[PDB]
Amino acid sequence: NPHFFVTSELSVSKLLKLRQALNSSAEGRYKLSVNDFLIKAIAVACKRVPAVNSSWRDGVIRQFDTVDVSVAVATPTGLITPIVKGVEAKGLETISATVKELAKKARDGKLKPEDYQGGTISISNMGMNPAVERFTAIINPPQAAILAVGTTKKVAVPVENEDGTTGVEWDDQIVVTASFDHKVVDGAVGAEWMRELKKVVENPLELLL
Amino acid sequence: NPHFFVTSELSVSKLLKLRQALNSSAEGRYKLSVNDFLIKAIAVACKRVPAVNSSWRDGVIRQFDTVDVSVAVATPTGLITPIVKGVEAKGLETISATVKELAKKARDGKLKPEDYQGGTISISNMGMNPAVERFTAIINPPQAAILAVGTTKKVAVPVENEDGTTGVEWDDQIVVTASFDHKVVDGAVGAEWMRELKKVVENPLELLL
Amino acid sequence: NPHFFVTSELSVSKLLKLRQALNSSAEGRYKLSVNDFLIKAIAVACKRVPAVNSSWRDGVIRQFDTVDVSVAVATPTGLITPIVKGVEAKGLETISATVKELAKKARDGKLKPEDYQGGTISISNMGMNPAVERFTAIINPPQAAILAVGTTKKVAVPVENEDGTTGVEWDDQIVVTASFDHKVVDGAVGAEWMRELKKVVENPLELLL
Amino acid sequence: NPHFFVTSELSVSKLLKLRQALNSSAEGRYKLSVNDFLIKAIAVACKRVPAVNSSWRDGVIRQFDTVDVSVAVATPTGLITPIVKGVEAKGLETISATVKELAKKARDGKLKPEDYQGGTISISNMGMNPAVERFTAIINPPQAAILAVGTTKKVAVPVENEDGTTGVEWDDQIVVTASFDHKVVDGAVGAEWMRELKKVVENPLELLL
């Protein structure tokens, strides 16, 4: 299993501003987190290039026209992978309610058994606790790509103010990792998908596009 | 062998201050290095959560109540793994003398043959030379986790001084990597162990705890 | 295949200055890129320590006195690995012309079939597009080490000006990754090769050495 | 029974600072008092010189390699001596929990009968109430040394400030007393043990040593 690890580095301050604005405008019917924006962005990204969201059979490979995103949730019994289907068609409040409902279902017991079967990309995120920057779980056998998300730190970013020739103003910054299979997805298309994903995420206004 | 790589990023300036104070107070009977603090901290960390320090047999797994730490040393013949046992009970001067004596034994020849058998976590550190930030040797077959340590760089860290709204003051910072097995230790407990390890190391005053 | 991933972090501003000077002095007969300096530097580095540029047969291993560098190029059909031989003897303009000619040959069709066989280290570099910092393709079967190159970012670097006690002046900085085999090349010699490679690259004036 | 009384005078302000720091950093799982630092320090001190922690049989004497510390607790029924074993191996939070649990066990009733047998040095401390500076209970028959602790007062300590040729700044100060047997432990080794104990306690940073 030749799984090569690529990475990217994303600026999220715009996402924080948008999340705060939407949460303040909310009347309580929905709750938003950064994982919501990440899953919507990666759904749009997979719509952009369908190469990443494929599967490998015995010899032959199959490509999915639609997008099905599996999210990892931590349970005392082990690792659970709830699924959400048709993410591109849905908004972000609906997927928010779906993921929180699936999480609480995992808390109170076991889920309906076909919530485990299916999917195109597996997503894991321990950004809640600190002391984690990079990680990559093994790719699931029916999958072809896994995207892992670390925590958000606070580092200096290039700025070109006039009074200060160099200038230093700080921004929040996050690290993502992607493990592919190299049997279906090669390095070039993975780098393309990552760069266009960063292009989508850096300015969130194109999420509605 | 699904070995997933997690990482953390540690501040060591407090450790440097403590090491300098103890070395100045020393009368020559003991010599201290950063590896000493790392091995003591990880011993306490394994005491905190015993899940990481286990082993896998044919099908069944075995959990060790005590801690046995194997340290990697570079030799012209190859790679050697001296062992230290009961690290949690011992202080740091005793383990310091033990590791330096084992290192010089490796220099002058071969060791007693049962110094190779046993252990719970393997530790490797090439922080002596520069030009290394991340690395991860393969996990030893009777082990379940390996922690590798890079070098210490000097980077900017968040500060909240009054005169400067952003403010910039620099600190030394180190990178650690952890390769687990995923047959015994899953991602969640590994992240827990790493975050509590960083909590222990960041302020060294809890080492005596 | 126990492929352990080591990394380094290089300052390239001197290389940019030298590249700009040589390109301005050029009359059009040659074109220079950062990949040229990297391949020349790694050729000299392999000349420094011949351990990395070896191959593994069935049980026995073979060491190459000369250097043969294979460079990866992205093609719509897939991944292509043109080869350049005797790089240490040649300058940098000759290897520049050779690599650009091989790239355009890959563009317009297929190459002469023995351009695929041979080599000591495989080099891949997607530094052209942004949104990539670390990656590592699997080592080719007749090879023993692969060096991957990310993009160049702009980060703060330690400075010791008098007026500012800390001081902050920024520099361009690049990330490199190295995947070895651990059947032939162990961690120590890999770290040695990486540190001496960084020593060569940081100040490019030793390239002519 | 020729029990000669030696004494020492200790500065504890550093211990108060360390205790306050650790208690503030505590999340409630442990509670620390000065007696904890004293018992850990004397355990390390007995490890330093094993002469004090011995016992006398009929004619012959026996020396203990390990350390077992008996602490005196005041009960309405009389005087009770709970025991803690292997103190040097354990930290200070574990012995803290052990001593508080033994104290509350003495409060709610009688203890398991073998908690009375064994030990190397008996420790008594009425530092809680004021109006006590020196005291010394008789040595227990199977013991060879008893260390009693008074209360902490506030007295002037030598200082060498520049503006004030003499200078006066005040510090907290405690008095300790030691009654030996003179059948096993003579004056010289007792004075050695006391001076090295004061050396350990005055700067608590060597407790982790």
Residue numbers in the entry:
A (entry chain A), B (entry chain A), C (entry chain A), D (entry chain A): 251 to 459
From the reporting publication:
Architecturally, the core consists of 60 subunits that form a near-symmetric icosahedral structure, formed by 20 trimeric subunits at each corner. In fungi, the core-forming subunit is exclusively E218, whereas in mammals the core is composed of a mixture of E2 and E3BP in either a 48:1219 or 40:20 E2:E3BP ratio. The E2 active site binds CoA and catalyzes the transacetylase reaction, in which the acetyl group from the N6-lipoyllysine, located in the peripheral LD of E2 and E3BP, is transferred onto the thiol group of CoA.
Here, we report a cryo-EM structure of the fully active Chaetomium thermophilum pyruvate dehydrogenase complex (PDHc) core scaffold at 3.85 Å resolution (FSC = 0.143) from native cell extracts. The reconstruction of the core with an application of icosahedral symmetry was resolved at 3.85 Å resolution (FSC = 0.143), where the backbone is clearly traceable and side chain resolution is often visible. We cannot rule out, that this close proximity is a result of averaging, but we suspect the existence of an arginine cluster. Flexible regions were first detected above the E2 active site. A previously described backfolded structural element is not seen in the native PDHc core scaffold structure, allowing increased accessibility to the LD to be accommodated in the E2 active site.
